[PDB]
Amino acid sequence: DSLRPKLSEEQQRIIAILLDAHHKTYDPTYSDFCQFRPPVRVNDGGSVTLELSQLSMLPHLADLVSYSIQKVIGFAKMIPGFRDLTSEDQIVLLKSSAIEVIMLRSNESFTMDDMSWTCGNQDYKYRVSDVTKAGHSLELIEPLIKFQVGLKKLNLHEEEHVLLMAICIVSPDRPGVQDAALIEAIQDRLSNTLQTYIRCRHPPPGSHLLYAKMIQKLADLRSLNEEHSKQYRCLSFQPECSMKLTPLVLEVFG
Template sequence: HVVKLGGWVEWRLAMQLLEMELMEARTLLPDPANEFDRNVPRICGVCGDKATGFHFNAMTCEGCKGFFRRSMKRKAMFTCPFNSDCKITKDNRRHCQACRLKRCVDIGMMKEFILTDEEVQRKREMITKRKEEEALKESMKPKLSEEQQRVIDILLEAHRKTYDPTYSDFTQFRVSSSSKRITRSSSVLTHGSSSEDSSDTFNCSLECVENRMFSNMALNEDSDRSPPMDINLSHLSMLPHLADLVSYSIQKVIGFAKMIPGFRDLTAEDQIALLKSSAIEIIMLRSNESFSLEDMAWSCGGNEFKYQIDDVTQAGHNLELLEPLVKFQVSLKKLNLHVEEHVLLMGICILSPDRPGLQDTSLVESLQDRLSEVLQTYILCKHPPPGNRLLYAKMIQKLADLRSLNEEHSKQYRCLSFKPEHSMQLTPLVLEVFGNEIS
């Protein structure tokens, strides 16, 4: 006799819930006995029909589950018309209730696991409450709004249009006679650009300011040809090539920036101020896609355009810039950013309200805040742990690192530009964007 005293009902309910959880776990975890074939169906231990789970401490079908419950609740007494050894199958299980009940007991079904109607109702209420709590918990999780997802989609499309992962245009950059790379006849900045690339110049709304500050964006062939061979640049053999690469990258950065939601709402002067001050930082961010942790080099389309530290030193930069640059690339790579996080970080970097020369800092700050909010929400929703731990803070720290790199780049660019034989190898666009650094 089972005495239902305080806690006994709760214990039985807990046992039933535990039984359900164990059943779910068994369906999720591989069964070593059936590991060779996970599609093997579960069989009812009473009649051999397809089982639906553990019921009253045994694996049974729904039919035998209901039969055992009814028999126990009615305290039924059955008699076998044969020899009490009937073989119970799916087809004949209704023929001999005595042997069927005996088989239920033999495989371990226990009447103690049968709940009363009140207990069944309480169990259902507990299950419903648990589902409601899980639904509430799920509803409280941050979610990307339609507007936030639209912003991400726009930035992804902007990046797709302005970043070529094949680096096919690199074959058209200038090289010196001592370089092993392919020599071109004219600059990629004047030939071979796609229709999408042609949009990388400012539109007519910026025309008046463009003529003054970005007048050299549409370069002519003569101004961008390789330098005369009688100029001695043996110690900076990579300068012409890297100058073309940077100039090409600036155009792509401009094209990306113009598609950032809200960027066109800024005045032409503020757009130019943001681009001139952030261009080299975005180039460094973009280059992380081609950076390899294996050899600490930038691989842009195979070994032909694989840039080592020595290559960049041959363009006039020293280790005071390159050492922290490589450390930055390594640490950024190890964050394993999603492409969505990468493009949002570039947008946040461009829309920095503390750039010199800005007029409407409040508008720039509001645009940057919107992208920052989208980035934080995306990390919470889409970036799984442990990679998301403090990820936003780490990404913002990268922007601070970029400022330091920008300052060092400006310092070294000034030294490079002081010498006419070197400044002659820079493209008009590079001179225009970084020209404010020349005294």
């Protein structure tokens, strides 16, 4: 059975655009990271009370996430069709997808060598313990690491990666969207591109139900999104927390 239509010229163009958009918005040398407020790692081999007292890693990780949100805004703007949406719908989609696209794009620095996000020397190597020093708990972090491993092991082509990030952003089932049908049309064009790509270009056995595995990752992301939001709320109750964040982070997660 399994028909394998060739990518259309339009679908090839969509893929080219998204690759270019990623290459322009994702620096794989992490060369800007020395501009963030510095990482600080307090002794915390154990403590939620101490973590909240210090939030030693929060200014660095908030800057990292803020920077990443800016990059995702830039990427989104280059997604074919995104600019056909109204401004209110663009913003709803960005704010609701931001943490999920950050999680997806971070997969590129994530390494199964030692289950870290390695963005340079020791200073810019991020482990579970660094995320607890920014005030999050294991209810978010452990499923996040499991998600990163699961995604890594799909061995996505860059084409598939950038399409998944685009599909994540242009989702019609986000609360507060107005033109759901237009968003769904944009998404379907990207989804069809991805399905076609996988069937033409992705060798076996990694192609086996790869599309369904990728859609499952999107569902997984909704769950992480909800847990992050719960935890962010609690972190936001810590006095003086706002100075450790950024204006963009406060808006997107507030």
